[PDB]
């Protein structure tokens, strides 16, 4: 079997992407944020505290296939300080025509303020390794892990758009969606992430520096977070750019024409166009814009978020030894 679903930006800044998901019998359609940096499928629900709901909800008592997982609870927090917690059902879940039976669906009892404030996101669908799942006492498998037995190949692909719709595919590689060939690189699962080592970088039309950059592929993070010395080398080539203590990163004039940024995948090279690194104005009508490349020093790990991933066709190979592939598009 295979599945194919359309993914859409939530707003004009590409802050996040949403994908439809069918839960239960008859199907209830919710728009979820597909997150390769976490491993929980959780939703707004009929159980969520009413003052914390502003979203489409899942009602397990209206699904003939829902089963309560007795004794099970969950609790998660993310890199931005947001959080949620609750209890656990198993139910039928479909994505783009691909159906899984017995999937764990984590029903929120409570959500943090940033989730209440965002009307467009009905929950998250995690696609990292199942060792990061937060259900206790026994951790639960991701949607991808449960689908592998039926899939035509144990793979999914991410094709995110720049201010445009894109696609998540399960079980096949669409050879018409990229240019050139896919280059694969080794993955470490020691911390539970799609963790890999880039071979180096170049700024604009300058020289490629061979320097190892350990980081994670995270569709749930908006920006590209890299070492302080690498980020300083990029913004040195933008004449109005400065670090702003009060805004919380590099800012620059909206009228600048920005250089591209290239990262290494083995011997291959992925080029991020300069326009992708203009995140947008600090407020509507401002002369100053926020940068899409920022220092990772406050996180402690480098993060290849949407600014980087939307420049490529990305293959998440979930064979017993996993690998990560990148192609230009």
């Amino acid at each position: 079997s295979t599945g194919s679903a359309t993914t859409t930006p939530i707003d004009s800044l590409d802050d996040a992407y949403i994908t439809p998901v069918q839960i239960g019998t008859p199907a209830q359609t919710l728009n979820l944020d597909f997150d390769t940096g976490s491993s929980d499928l959780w939703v707004f629900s009929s159980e969520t505290t009413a003052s914390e709901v502003x979203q489409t909800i899942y009602t397990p008592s209206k699904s003939t296939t829902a089963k309560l997982l007795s004794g099970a609870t969950w609790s998660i927090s993310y890199g931005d300080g947001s959080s949620s917690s609750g209890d656990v059902y198993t139910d039928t879940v479909s994505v783009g025509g691909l159906t899984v039976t017995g999937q764990a669906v984590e029903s929120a009892k409570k959500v943090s303020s940033s989730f209440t404030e965002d009307s467009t996101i009905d929950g998250l669908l995690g696609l990292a390794f199942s060792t990061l799942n937060t259900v206790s006492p026994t951790q639960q498998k991701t949607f991808f892990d449960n689908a592998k037995a039926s899939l035509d190949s144990p793979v999914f692909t991410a094709d995110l758009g720049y201010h445009a719709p894109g696609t998540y595919n399960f079980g096949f590689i669409d050879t018409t969606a990229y240019t050139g060939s896919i280059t694969y690189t080794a993955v470490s699962t020691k911390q539970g992430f799609w963790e890999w080592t880039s071979t180096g970088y170049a700024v604009g039309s300058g020289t490629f520096k061979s320097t190892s950059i350990d980081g994670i592929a995270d569709t749930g993070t908006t920006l590209l977070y890299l070492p302080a010395t690498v980020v300083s080398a990029y913004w040195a080539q933008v004449s109005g750019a400065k670090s702003s203590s009060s805004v919380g990163g590099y800012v620059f004039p909206c009228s600048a024409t920005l250089p591209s940024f290239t990262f290494g995948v083995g011997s291959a090279r992925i080029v991020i166009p300069g326009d992708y690194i203009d995140f947008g104005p600090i407020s509507t009508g401002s002369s100053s814009c926020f940068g899409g490349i920022q220092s990772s020093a406050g996180i402690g790990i480098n993060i290849f978020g949407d600014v980087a991933l939307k420049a490529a066709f990305v293959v998440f190979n979930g064979a017993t030894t996993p690998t990560l592939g990148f192609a230009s598009k």
Binding site: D15, S39, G192, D218, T222
Partner: peptide
């Protein structure tokens, strides 16, 4: 901006 686990 979002920063999806800690």
């Amino acid at each position: 901006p979002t920063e999806x686990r800690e």
